[PDB]
Amino acid sequence: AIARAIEVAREVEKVAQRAEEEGNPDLRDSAKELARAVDEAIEEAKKQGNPELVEWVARAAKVAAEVIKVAIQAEKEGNRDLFRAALELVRAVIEAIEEAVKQGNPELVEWVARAAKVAAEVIKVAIQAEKEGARDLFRLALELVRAVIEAIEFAVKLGDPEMVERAARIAKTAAELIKRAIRAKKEGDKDQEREAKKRVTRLIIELTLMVLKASLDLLRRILEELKEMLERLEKNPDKDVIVKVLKVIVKAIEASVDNQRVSADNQKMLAELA
Amino acid sequence: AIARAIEVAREVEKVAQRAEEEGNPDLRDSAKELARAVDEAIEEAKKQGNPELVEWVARAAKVAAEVIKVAIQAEKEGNRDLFRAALELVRAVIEAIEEAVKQGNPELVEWVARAAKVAAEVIKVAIQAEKEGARDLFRLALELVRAVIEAIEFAVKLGDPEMVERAARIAKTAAELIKRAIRAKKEGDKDQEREAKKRVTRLIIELTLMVLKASLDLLRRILEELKEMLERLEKNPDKDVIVKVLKVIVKAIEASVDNQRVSADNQKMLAELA
Amino acid sequence: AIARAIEVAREVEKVAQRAEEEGNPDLRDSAKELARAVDEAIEEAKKQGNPELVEWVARAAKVAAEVIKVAIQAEKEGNRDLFRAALELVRAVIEAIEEAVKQGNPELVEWVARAAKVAAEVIKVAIQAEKEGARDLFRLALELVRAVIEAIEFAVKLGDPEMVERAARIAKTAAELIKRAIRAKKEGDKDQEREAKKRVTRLIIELTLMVLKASLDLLRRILEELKEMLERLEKNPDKDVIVKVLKVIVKAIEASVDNQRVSADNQKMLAELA
């Protein structure tokens, strides 16, 4: 199809950007996984049948190619922390697209592509905080991109596209508030700049709260899976059944550690807010 | 006794309110469980012997009957979220009374009846926020009733009547501050209204903090029960002993998930406060 | 050596202070464990060989002797809560020194001695809040010492001396801000006093956040130890292997309960801040 042709062209551009950074192998490592994931995504999409799913994978991969170009720029100039944030966004989009396509959602991959483009804009706003001296605003943008990454990863687990949409609209609203805070910082008026930056911190907290409740909903589902295996264990206390229960117990620990990790970062945002 | 007679009369009023809402079966489902629980409570009380316990179950059941009348009103008018909050309070009082009577506490059921009447007043204040346009104040009242429900449920687990008393005095003090915030909103003076609403949010946080520490005290007791079964396991690594340990491990997970659930809701109150 | 001689003299002073409080047995219980721990520490240090480790154990034990003298003073005068805070600091320094010496760190014991002396200064500032009427400032100092105790205990687990140094510099900066808040409270100017006390609360939160992330790093290491034993269990689902996995699962629960305990106390600091 015509949409499949612009994907091959997008794939060709990705191959060029993958071969462009022959000097840095670490980014080229994740740059090749994006070529592998998209190839798997397109072949998995044509197996599924939905052509709408084939189009939204392209737009997200088109955004991921530009984020890779930011990862190349992040080495020579900008913070090295920005490079890791660019790579974290790349691997997050790769894993989010794969699982969302394996789930067979034509709408979840859409908002994943929508949120990835919005998160790409926030990274661009972070660069204005580097040229125009604003390391504090540079953190807010990196903290916001971090909150979007956690929102996308957990919403793909839930398979809820509405959560990705609501996380993208709050992120896009916060990005324009950082742009207004940058235009403020340029034009003085720090009574407006400080109120805009606290509005952004409020929106970063509003995102991490939705991520915390989503991780809590996953912790409930694992709890029910653990309850049904206990009621199974009371019937047949076998040797292999206990091994499976131990595996599910550790799976619940992984989700609780991530839930305590989000609340640990969300609690620092409140200390910055107040 | 004379006190037992006003309980039968209170039981007759409950039967009438249970039969009044013949149209809605879902509320009638929980309305009949209250008739079953009180009957069990009165028969359990006369088996225990203490007549003071028989009186405080009546006053709480008299309050629960009026909350049911609010649940009937909450369908045709008011928020549907208010109906679920009314039902949540009913099932919470039912389970709190049962466990507190099975524990044999003549003082815990008292403050449970005291806190249930105070929580009923807060629901009444929420209705003033519906007529007098105040959806923000409507949340604060529903958030406050939610904090009282968690405070009563965990304090009945601890069997601590002093915690219920202190949660009821903070809730009654906060309710009068919402009334003052409503009388403020009526008479302008939003410098006083905004300070009264933030005083309420501070008290809602002060309650959820006491609920979080109480759930943490329960998490310690389960930890000691898990330690004593490990030291038992080192003596006899049997097949059935491991099954009991797995059950206690999941019981600790249920308490930790609830503790992370309270802190997740308590953290949103801080975002609203600051 | 000459340094070993001032340790024997310091040990003699500790024996005198241990025998001075013959009336109170509970403090004498922990006072004798300090004599046992230092004796073990000096003998363990001469076995290790490093003479620098022998010197820093003395300075921390010299500070711990003065904290014991505060524990004696805390009975007849001052809050009884201050006595428990003094004992908590003593047992924390005892266990921190022991583990840090068994780990063989000549630099971790240094900053443990540095942080113990800084924490001793904060306790002295708490006494000024008792004479000069300031129970609110008395809590801030006791809350700050509590945050230092948690910071030292978890950093000794990590074996990270840089964390102890950064926790000591924030604690010393906060202590001078409480001194400035006390000199403010004396000389009126509550616009400066209230801003200094909120600066201290911000620094107390900044410490507990570093303690929360450190406890989260320990929770990751236990997670990897639990993953490697699962992959071991898939190879050999034995009887004794499951027992060891159950022990590691409970070890992870102990770390998660402590992590939820720190966040529970850190969340009350935000309610006091905002």
What residue of A is the nearest CA neighbor of B256? A256
Of A203, A239, A245, nearest to A223 by C-alpha is A245
Question: Helices in C134-238 by DSSP H: which ranges?
Answer: 135-158, 161-186, 190-235
- Using CA atoms, how far residue C242 sits from A119, B203, C220, C229, in Å, is 45, 47, 21, 9
Given a contact cutoff of 8 angstroms between Cβ atoms, the answer to whether A56 and A113 are in contact is: yes
DSSP class of residue B1 equals -
What residue of B is the nearest CA neighbor of C270? B270
CA distance A248 to chain B (A): 11
What residue of A is the nearest CA neighbor of B240? A237
What residue of B is the nearest CA neighbor of C273? B274
What residue of A is the nearest CA neighbor of C198? A274
Helix (H, G, I), strand (E, B) or coil at A145: helix
Given a contact cutoff of 8 angstroms between Cβ atoms, the answer to whether B119 and B171 are in contact is: yes
Distance between the two ends of chain B, CA-based, in angstroms?
A: 54
- Using CA atoms, how far residue A50 sits from A95, A104, A148, in Å, is 20, 9, 27
Q: Which amino acid is at C23?
A: G
Beta-carbon count within 10 A of A94 CB = 21
Exposure string over B146-167, b if 16+ CB within 10 A, otherwise e: bbbbbbbbbbbbbebbebbbbb
Q: Does B237 touch chain A (CB under 8 A)?
A: no
How far is residue B245's CA from residue B266's CA, in Å, rounded to a whole number?
31
How far is residue A102's CA from residue A96's CA, in Å, rounded to a whole number?
10
Candidates A243, A251, A258, partner chain C, best to mutate (most C CBs within 10 A): A243
Given a contact cutoff of 8 angstroms between Cβ atoms, the answer to whether B120 and B93 are in contact is: no
In this complex, the residue of B220, B245, B266 whose CB is nearest that of residue C267 is B266
CA distance C125 to chain B (A): 28
DSSP class of residue A22 equals -
What residue of A is the nearest CA neighbor of B241? A237
- Using CA atoms, how far residue B126 sits from B74, B93, C234, in Å, is 11, 19, 56
Given a contact cutoff of 8 angstroms between Cβ atoms, the answer to whether C147 and C138 are in contact is: no
Given a contact cutoff of 8 angstroms between Cβ atoms, the answer to whether A210 and A163 are in contact is: yes
Quick one: tokens of C74? 């805390």
Quick one: tokens of A248? 């599910």
Q: Which amino acid is at B202?
A: R
Domain count for chain B:
1
In this complex, the residue of A243, A256, A267 whose CB is nearest that of residue C233 is A243
How far is residue C134's CA from residue C178's CA, in Å, rounded to a whole number?
11
| Radius of gyration from C-alpha coordinates of chain A | 21
Residues in chain C: 274
Task: Please provide residue A104's backbone torsions phi and psi, each rounded to the nearest 5 degrees.
Answer: 80, 40
Residue B148 within any structural domain of the chain: yes
Q: Which amino acid is at A270?
A: L
Interchain CB distance below 8 Å, B270 and A266: no
Q: Does C274 touch chain A (CB under 8 A)?
A: yes
CA A63 to chain centre: 13
Write out the residue range of the structural domain in which residue B211 sits. Answer: 2-223+252-273
Q: Which residues contact B79 (CB under 8 A, 6 or more apart)?
A: B130, B138
To one decimal, the resolution in angstroms is: 3.6
Q: Which residues contact A262 (CB under 8 A, 6 or more apart)?
A: A150, A208, A211, A212, A215
DSSP class of residue B23 equals S
Quick one: tokens of A247? 């595996």
Residue with structure tokens 């308590």?
Answer: B266
Please count the helices (runs of H) and the strands (runs of E) in chain A: 9, 0
Beta-carbon count within 10 A of B80 CB = 9
Interchain CB distance below 8 Å, B230 and C242: no
Helix (H, G, I), strand (E, B) or coil at C85: helix
Residue C237 within any structural domain of the chain: no
Cα dihedral: B182, B185, B189, B192 (round 10): 40
How far is residue B186's CA from residue B178's CA, in Å, rounded to a whole number?
12
Residue B93 within any structural domain of the chain: yes
Q: Which residues contact C124 (CB under 8 A, 6 or more apart)?
A: C70
Of A131, A149, A136, nearest to A86 by C-alpha is A149
Quick one: tokens of C100? 């840090």
Exposure string over C178-199, b if 16+ CB within 10 A, otherwise e: bbbbbebbeeeeeeebeebbbb
Residue with structure tokens 């006595």?
Answer: C83
Residue A178 within any structural domain of the chain: yes
Exposure string over C215-248, b if 16+ CB within 10 A, otherwise e: bbebbeebbeebeebbeebeeeeeeeebbebbeb
Q: Does B245 touch chain A (CB under 8 A)?
A: no
Q: E strands within chain A?
A: none
Subunits touching C (CB < 8 Å, at least 3 pairs)?
A, B
Residue with structure tokens 């501070």?
Answer: B202
Q: Is C16 exposed, middle or buried (0-12, 13-18, 19+ CB in 10 A)?
A: exposed
* Residues of B whose CB is below 8 A from A267: 267
In this complex, the residue of A205, A219, A237 whose CB is nearest that of residue B271 is A205
Given a contact cutoff of 8 angstroms between Cβ atoms, the answer to whether B123 and B145 are in contact is: yes
* Residues of A whose CB is below 8 A from B226: none
How far is residue A212's CA from residue A195's CA, in Å, rounded to a whole number?
26
Quick one: tokens of C263? 């966040």
Angle at B216 between CA B212 and CA B221, to 5 degrees: 150
Interchain CB distance below 8 Å, A264 and C213: yes
Residue with structure tokens 């959806």?
Answer: B135
Interchain CB distance below 8 Å, C267 and B242: no
Helix (H, G, I), strand (E, B) or coil at A132: coil
Angle at B105 between CA B100 and CA B111, to 5 degrees: 75
Percent helix, strand and coil across chain B, each to the nearest 5: 90, 0, 10
Given a contact cutoff of 8 angstroms between Cβ atoms, the answer to whether B177 and B189 are in contact is: no
Residue C211 within any structural domain of the chain: yes
Q: Which residues contact B176 (CB under 8 A, 6 or more apart)?
A: none
* Residues of C whose CB is below 8 A from A254: 223
DSSP class of residue C241 equals H
Of C150, C117, C144, nearest to C129 by C-alpha is C144
Cα dihedral: A165, A166, A170, A173 (round 10): 50
Residue with structure tokens 């509550």?
Answer: C190
DSSP class of residue C106 equals T
How far is residue A96's CA from residue C74's CA, in Å, rounded to a whole number?
58
Q: Which amino acid is at A8?
A: V
Residue A117 within any structural domain of the chain: yes
